[PDB]
Amino acid sequence: SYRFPVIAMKVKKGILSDYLSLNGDVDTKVKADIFPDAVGKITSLRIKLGAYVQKGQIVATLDPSRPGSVYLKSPVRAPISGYILNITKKIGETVNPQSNIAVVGRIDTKQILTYVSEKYISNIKVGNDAIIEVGAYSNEKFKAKVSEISPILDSKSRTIEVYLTPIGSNLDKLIIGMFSKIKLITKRFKDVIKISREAVVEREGKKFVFKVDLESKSVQMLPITVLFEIDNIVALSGEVEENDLIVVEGMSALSNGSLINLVDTKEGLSAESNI
């Protein structure tokens, strides 16, 4: 007793990656709005979301109709072949030839569009890896690669368009028209000691961590350099080796050489990338 207790980490070398948090939409390179030829009322829908349609195929029907006439017309036809990606009108609604009824296009030319601000663009290059996230779980995250950076800077919004091509499998669930968080990876620090942000401790205008010595059951305060910090993880360099025991809870009470009580040893952070 009179000793300060702890939980430590079995520290490991790994990869900490820098990334930009962006927002983007799932688009397709080949799509088109279905516009009617006549003004009038929707009498039937012969399409469902998901349906493949031939160019010129009848998709919706209208009133025959007017007083009148003399051009009694005209069904709605698909402007190109493809899949129905959206339906924007229902039975009963009236439509002019500038009324978007639905969208058709290809499901195999998926593309993520995102507008990177002027101040962040510099660190981006074609071939960069990215994670497209629509949710928190494994089925809701997909891999991608930067395909194309526009040379044009929209002087209005101060942004450059970056396009990303998704890769891997599960891409079925990456649905066209969806919103996505994008994590665009600009760099990776390989072969660095990774530790939770908490273990790092500012005392006297300098950062340290606490290495545990199992034989003497006490700690040593070592000066450390933070190389990079992200996701509440820290990459560092120092006289910390693989498998050293560094404290990840209870550093408020400690000084250099203070005795301790090791309650449990947490397993190290993944040797592979944070993202």
Residue numbers in the entry: 43 to 317
Provide excerpts from the study.
The crystal structure of the complete BesA protein was solved by SAD in three space groups, P212121 (2.35 Å resolution), P21 (2.5 Å) and C2 (2.6 Å), in which either a monomer (C2) or four intertwined head-to-tail monomers (P21 and P212121) are present in the asymmetric unit. The BesA monomer shows the archetypal, multidomain adaptor topology, with the MP, β-barrel, and lipoyl domains in linear arrangement (coloured orange, yellow and green, respectively). However, the expected final α-hairpin domain is completely absent, confirming what was predicted from sequence analysis, leaving only a nine residue loop (Pro106 to Leu114, blue in Fig. 1B) linking the two halves of the lipoyl domain. Density for this loop is visible only in the C2 monomer where it is stabilised by the loop of a neighbouring monomer in the crystal lattice, but high B-factors here and poorly defined density for the P212121 or P21 monomers indicate the small loop is highly flexible. In both the data-based assembly model of AcrAB-TolC and the in vitro co-crystal structure of an adaptor-transporter (CusBA) subcomplex tripartite pump assembly is facilitated by the flexibility of the adaptor’s serially-linked domains, which was confirmed by MD analysis of the closely related MexA. This ‘hinge’ flexibility at the inter-domain linkers is also evident in the BesA variant space groups which show movement of the lipoyl domain, relative to the other domains.
Periplasmic adaptor proteins are essential components of bacterial tripartite multidrug efflux pumps. BesA shows the archetypal linear, flexible, multi-domain architecture evident among proteobacteria and retains the lipoyl, β-barrel and membrane-proximal domains that interact with the periplasmic domains of the inner membrane transporter. However, it lacks the α-hairpin domain shown to establish extensive coiled-coil interactions with the periplasmic entrance helices of the outer membrane-anchored TolC exit duct. The adaptor multidomain structure is conserved throughout proteobacteria, but primary sequence comparison in the spirochete Borrelia burgdorferi suggested that a tripartite MDR pump, BesABC, included an adaptor that appeared to lack an α-hairpin.
